[PDB]
Amino acid sequence: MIPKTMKAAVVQGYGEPLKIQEVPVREPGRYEVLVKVMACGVCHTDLHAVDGDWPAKPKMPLIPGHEGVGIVVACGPDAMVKEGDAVGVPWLYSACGCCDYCITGWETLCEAQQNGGYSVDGGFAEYVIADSRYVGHLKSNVNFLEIAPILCAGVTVYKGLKETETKPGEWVAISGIGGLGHVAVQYAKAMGMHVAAIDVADDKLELAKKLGADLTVNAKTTDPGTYLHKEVGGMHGALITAVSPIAFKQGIDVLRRKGTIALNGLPPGSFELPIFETVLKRITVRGSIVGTRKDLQEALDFANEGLVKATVTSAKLEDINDVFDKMKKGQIDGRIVLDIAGS
Amino acid sequence: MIPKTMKAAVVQGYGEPLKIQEVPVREPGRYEVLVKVMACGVCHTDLHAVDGDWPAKPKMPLIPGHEGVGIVVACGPDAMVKEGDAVGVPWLYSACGCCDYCITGWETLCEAQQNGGYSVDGGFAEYVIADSRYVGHLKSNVNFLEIAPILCAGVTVYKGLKETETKPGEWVAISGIGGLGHVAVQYAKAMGMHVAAIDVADDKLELAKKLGADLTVNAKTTDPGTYLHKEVGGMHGALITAVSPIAFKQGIDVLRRKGTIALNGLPPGSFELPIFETVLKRITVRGSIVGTRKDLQEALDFANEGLVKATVTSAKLEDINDVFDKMKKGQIDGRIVLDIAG
Amino acid sequence: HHMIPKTMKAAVVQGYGEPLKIQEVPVREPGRYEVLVKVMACGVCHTDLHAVDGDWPAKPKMPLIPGHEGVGIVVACGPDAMVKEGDAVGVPWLYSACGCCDYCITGWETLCEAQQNGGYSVDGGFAEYVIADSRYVGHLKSNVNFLEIAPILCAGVTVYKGLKETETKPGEWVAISGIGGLGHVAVQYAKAMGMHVAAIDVADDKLELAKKLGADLTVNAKTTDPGTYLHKEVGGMHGALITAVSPIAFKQGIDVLRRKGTIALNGLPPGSFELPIFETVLKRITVRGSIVGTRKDLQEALDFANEGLVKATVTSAKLEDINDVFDKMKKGQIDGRIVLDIAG
Amino acid sequence: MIPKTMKAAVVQGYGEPLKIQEVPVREPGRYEVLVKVMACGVCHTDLHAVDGDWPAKPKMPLIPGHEGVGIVVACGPDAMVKEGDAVGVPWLYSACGCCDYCITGWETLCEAQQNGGYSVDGGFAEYVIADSRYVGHLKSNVNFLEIAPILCAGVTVYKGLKETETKPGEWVAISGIGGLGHVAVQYAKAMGMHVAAIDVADDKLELAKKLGADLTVNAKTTDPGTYLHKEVGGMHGALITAVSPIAFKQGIDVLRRKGTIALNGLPPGSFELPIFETVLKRITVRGSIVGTRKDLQEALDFANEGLVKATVTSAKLEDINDVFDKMKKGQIDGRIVLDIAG
Ligand SMILES: NC(=O)c1ccc[n+]([C@@H]2O[C@H](COP(=O)([O-])OP(=O)(O)OC[C@H]3O[C@@H](n4cnc5c(N)ncnc54)[C@H](O)[C@@H]3O)[C@@H](O)[C@H]2O)c1
Ligand SMILES: NC(=O)c1ccc[n+]([C@@H]2O[C@H](COP(=O)([O-])OP(=O)(O)OC[C@H]3O[C@@H](n4cnc5c(N)ncnc54)[C@H](O)[C@@H]3O)[C@@H](O)[C@H]2O)c1
Ligand SMILES: NC(=O)c1ccc[n+]([C@@H]2O[C@H](COP(=O)([O-])OP(=O)(O)OC[C@H]3O[C@@H](n4cnc5c(N)ncnc54)[C@H](O)[C@@H]3O)[C@@H](O)[C@H]2O)c1
Ligand SMILES: NC(=O)c1ccc[n+]([C@@H]2O[C@H](COP(=O)([O-])OP(=O)(O)OC[C@H]3O[C@@H](n4cnc5c(N)ncnc54)[C@H](O)[C@@H]3O)[C@@H](O)[C@H]2O)c1
Ligand SMILES: [Cl-]
Ligand SMILES: [Cl-]
Ligand SMILES: [Cl-]
Ligand SMILES: [Cl-]
Ligand SMILES: [Zn+2]
Ligand SMILES: [Zn+2]
Ligand SMILES: [Zn+2]
Ligand SMILES: [Zn+2]
Ligand SMILES: [Zn+2]
Ligand SMILES: [Zn+2]
Ligand SMILES: [Zn+2]
Ligand SMILES: [Zn+2]
Asked if residues C91 and C134 have their Cβ atoms less than 8 Å apart, the reply is no
Which helix (H) or strand (E) element contains residue C46?
Answer: helix C46-53
User: What is the SS3 assignment for B339?
Assistant: coil
Query: Taking CA atoms, what residue in B is nearest to D293?
Result: B103
CA dist A271 and C90 (Å) reads 48
Peptide bond into B61 cis (omega under 30): yes
How far is it between the farthest Cα atoms of chain D? 64
Cα angle, residue A137 at apex, residues A132 and A139 outer, rounded to 5°: 140
Amino acid (one-letter) located at D44 = H
User: d(Cα B161, Cα B295) in Å, to the nearest integer?
Assistant: 11
- Top-level CATH class of C1-153+292-344? alpha beta
CA–CA distance, B251 with A224 (Å, rounded to integer): 29
Distances A301 to A110, A309, B88, D68 between C-alpha atoms, Å: 25, 11, 55, 42
Are D4 and D17 in contact by the 8 Å Cβ rule? The answer is no
**What does the alpha-carbon distance between residue B309 and residue B303 come to, in Å, rounded to a whole number?**
6
Ligand 3 in reach of C201 Cβ (< 6 A): yes
Closest CA to B310 of B222, B186, B201: B186
E strands, B187-263, in order: 194-199, 215-218, 235-240, 255-263
* Phi, psi angles (nearest 5°) of residue A153: -50, -50
Three-state DSSP at A301 gives: helix
Which of D272, D282, D287 is closest, CB to CB, to C289? D282
Pocket of ligand 4 (CB under 6 A): C 281; D 43-45, 48, 152, 156, 175-181, 198-201, 204, 219, 241-244, 246-247, 264-267, 288-290, 327, 330, 332
Which of B217, B225, B232 is closest to B170 using CA atoms?
Answer: B232
CB C284 within 8 A of CB D291: no
d(CA C74, CA C133): 11
A60: phi then psi, degrees, rounded to nearest 5: -130, 135
The secondary element (H helix, E strand) that includes residue B38 is strand B32-41
List CB contacts of A141: < 8 A, sequence separation 6 or more: none
Fold classified for A152-289: Rossmann fold (3.40.50)
Cβ atoms D172, D238 nearer than 8 A: yes
Element (H, E) at D59: none
Closest atom of ligand 4 to CA, residue D159: 3
Task: Measure C266 CA to ligand 14 centroid, in angstroms.
Answer: 10
Q: How many CA atoms lie less than 13 Å away from A166 in the CB half-sphere? A: 35
Chain D residues close to A195, C-beta within 8 Å: none
Ligand nearest to the CA of D151: 15
Was C42 annotated as part of a binding site? no
* CATH 3.10.580.10 matches C154-291: no
Please, where in chain D does CATH 3.40.50.720 lie?
Answer: 152-289
- The residues, ordered by sequence, that sit 6+ positions from B94 with a Cβ below 8 Å of its Cβ are B113, B114, B131, B133, B134
Backbone φ and ψ of C186, nearest 5°: -60, -40
φ, ψ of residue B79 to 5 degrees: the values are -70, 145
Concatenated DSSP letters for A27-57? PP-TTEEEEEEEEEE--HHHHHHHHT-SSSP
Residue count of chain C: 344
Query: C272-276 and C196-201 as β-strands: parallel, antiparallel, unpaired?
Result: unpaired
Using CA atoms, how far apart are residues D84 and D72, in angstroms rounded to an integer?
Answer: 5
Residue C287 to residue D278, Cβ atoms within 8 A: yes
Largest CA distance in chain A: 64
- Give the span between the Cα atoms of D264 and D194, in whole angstroms: 19
Report whether B150 contacts B186 (CB < 8 A). Answer: no
CB contact under 8 A, A285 and B278: yes
Residue nearest to atom 10 of ligand 2 (CA): B265
Are the CB atoms for D335 and D311 separated by under 8 Å? Answer: yes
Resolution in A: 2.1
Q: Do C284 and D282 touch (CB under 8 A)?
A: no
Q: Give me the amino acid identity at D257.
A: R
Search chain D and give the residue with CA nearest A167. D191
Question: Could you tell me which CATH number the domain at D1-151+290-342 has?
Answer: 3.90.180.10
Neighbours of chain C (3+ CB pairs under 8 A): A, B, D
Calpha distance A194→A215 (Å, rounded) = 9
Give the Cα separation of D75 and D36 in Å (integer).
Answer: 12
Which residue type, as a one-letter code, is found at position A313? T
Shortest Cα distance from B192 to chain C (angstroms)?
Answer: 6
CATH no. for A1-151+290-343: 3.90.180.10
Q: CA-nearest residue of chain C to A97?
A: C99
Specify the domain boundaries for CATH 3.90.180.10 within chain B.
Answer: 1-151+290-342
**Cβ separation C274–D278 shorter than 8 A:** no
Angle separating helix axes A179-190 and A293-304, nearest 10 degrees: 80
Nearest to A213 by CA among A172, A252, A248, A241: A172
| Per-residue buried b or exposed e for A137-161, using 16+ beta carbons within 10 Å of the residue's own CB | ebeeebebbbbbbbbbbbbbbbbbb
Tell me, in angstroms, the distance from the centre of ligand 7 to residue C139's CA. 7
Closest CA to C302 of C170, C104, C137, C172: C137
Counting Cα atoms < 13 Å in the Cβ hemisphere of A201 gives 12
**Cβ-Cβ contacts under 8 Å, C266 against chain D:** 279
Which of C103, C271, C287 lies closest to D285 in CB terms?
C287
Residue C172 neighbours by CB under 8 Å, 6+ apart: C195, C196, C238, C239
Using a CB–CB cut-off of 8 Å, the residues of A that contact D are 162, 167-169, 190-192, 298, 301-302
- State phi, psi for B184 to the nearest 5 degrees: -60, -40
Q: 3-class SS at A261?
A: strand
Range C231-243 burial, b when 16+ CB lie within 10 A, else e: beeeebbbbbbbb
Q: Return the ligand number nearest the Cα of B257.
A: 10
Q: Count Cβ atoms within 10 A of the Cβ of residue A306 and give its class: 0-12 exposed, 13-18 middle, 19 or more buried.
A: exposed
Closest residue by Cα to residue D282 from D262, D260, D258: D258
Interruption sites in chain C after residues (C→N beyond 2.5 Å): none
Calculate how close chain C gets to D265, using CA atoms only, in Å.
Answer: 8
Residues on chain A touching C100 (C-beta within 8 angstroms): 80, 133, 293
The answer to whether B219 touches B204, Cβ cutoff 8 Å, is: no
DSSP sequence for D323-341: HHHHHHTT--SSEEEEE--
- Output the CA torsion sign for B147, B150, B153, B157: positive
Find all residues with CB under 8 Å of C82, minimum gap 6, and list them: A98, C33, C134, C135
What number of other Cβ atoms are within 10 A of residue A51's Cβ?
15
DSSP B123-170: SSBSEEEEETTTPEEE-TT--HHHHGGGGTHHHHHHHHHHHHTPPTTS
Q: Who's near A3: CB < 8 A, 6+ residues apart?
A: A25
CB B296 within 8 A of CB B167: no
Which of D57, D100, D164, D276 should one mutate to test binding to chain C, selecting the residue with the greatest count of C CBs within 10 A?
D276
Q: Do A105 and C109 touch (CB under 8 A)?
A: no
